[PDB]
Amino acid sequence: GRKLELTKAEKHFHNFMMDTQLTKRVKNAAANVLRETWLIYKNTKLVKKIDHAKVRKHQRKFLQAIHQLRSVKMEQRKLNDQANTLVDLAKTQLE
Amino acid sequence: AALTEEQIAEFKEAFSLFDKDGDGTITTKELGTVMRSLGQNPTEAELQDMINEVDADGNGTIDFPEFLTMMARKMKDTDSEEEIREAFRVFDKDGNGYISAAELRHVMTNLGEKLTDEEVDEMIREADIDGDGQVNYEEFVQMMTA
Ligand SMILES: O=C1Nc2c(ccc(Cl)c2Cl)/C1=N/O
Ligand SMILES: [Ca+2]
Ligand SMILES: [Ca+2]
């Protein structure tokens, strides 16, 4: 039988977005990653006059959006393993 | 994502592990119960999200058709050798890839669900391949997963 094998974990974002709330979280945080990447680039590379306070504001907004994205990714990883736990328990009835 | 008919009858028996009342649907309440009996603590939102990933019709609960259907999307397995080796490393104090037989007996008879000293004997008979009172657990795990 299966011996010591367990369900293989999945690959990418291609699931669990049916929870529109994570979807709302992903789409807002990713727009903000785009937003603050642009504004940091502009305020450091497309100006003669680097306004450090402006860069600080957008660095704080940037780290916020990145870690929001990280946080959604870890909750997807957690949901998949919770699901793989049920699939693994079910699968012991094949023994 | 398409498997055998024998497994259909098998997954039906699995379904009763989940349908704690036998009403033909899995609710979040029963899924919380089952998940907690496996040593996990999912939030109410995590339970609603697992049901909603399966829930074909939208009635908030999983039936065997929806249960069987998501089983096929998750049929592939992978070997567990590296995960088992890291469980052994937890007890590798020196980080040298060894755990003494005495240390292994102490762990197996004091932590988790435990083993009898007789059960531990058989285990160490197999684990100490070189008979030197030290378990090279990567070797021992490769022997058990081969
Ligand atoms: O995205 C998934 N949702 C799932 C999976 C596997 C099993 C179960 Cl019960 C659910 Cl609700 C998934 N595998 O990717
Ligand atoms: Ca039920
Ligand atoms: Ca249903």
Residue numbers in the entry:
A (entry chain B): 395 to 489
B (entry chain R): 2 to 147
Wording from the paper:
Small conductance Ca2+-activated K+ (SK) channels are a unique group of ion channels that are activated exclusively by intracellular Ca2+ levels. The Ca2+-binding protein calmodulin (CaM) is constitutively associated with SK channels and Ca2+-binding by CaM activates these channels. The Ca2+-sensor CaM associates with a channel CaM-binding domain (CaMBD), which is located within the channel C-terminus. Ca2+ binding to CaM induces conformational changes in both CaM and the channel CaMBD; these subsequently trigger opening of the channel pore.
But, substituting a phenylalanine for hydrophobic V407 dramatically enhanced SK2-a channel Ca2+ sensitivity by almost six-fold, from 0.30 ± 0.016 μM (n = 8) to 0.051 ± 0.0024 μM (n = 8, P < 0.0001). The V407F substitution is located in the SK2-a channel intrinsically disordered fragment (IDF), between E404 and M412. And, NS309 (6,7-dichloro-1H-indole-2,3-dione 3-oxime) increases Ca2+ sensitivity of SK channels with a higher potency. IDF conformation is flexible and, thus, invisible in the apo-crystal structure, whereas the drug NS309 stabilizes IDF, resulting in a well-defined conformation in the crystal structure. Similarly, in the V407F mutant structure, the electron density of the IDF was further improved by NS309. The newly identified V407F substitution stabilizes K405 in MD simulations, reminiscent of the impact of the small molecule NS309 on SK channel IDF conformation. In turn, stabilization of K405 enhances the mechanical coupling to channel opening, which is the likely mechanism for the Ca2+ hypersensitivity of the V407F mutant channels.
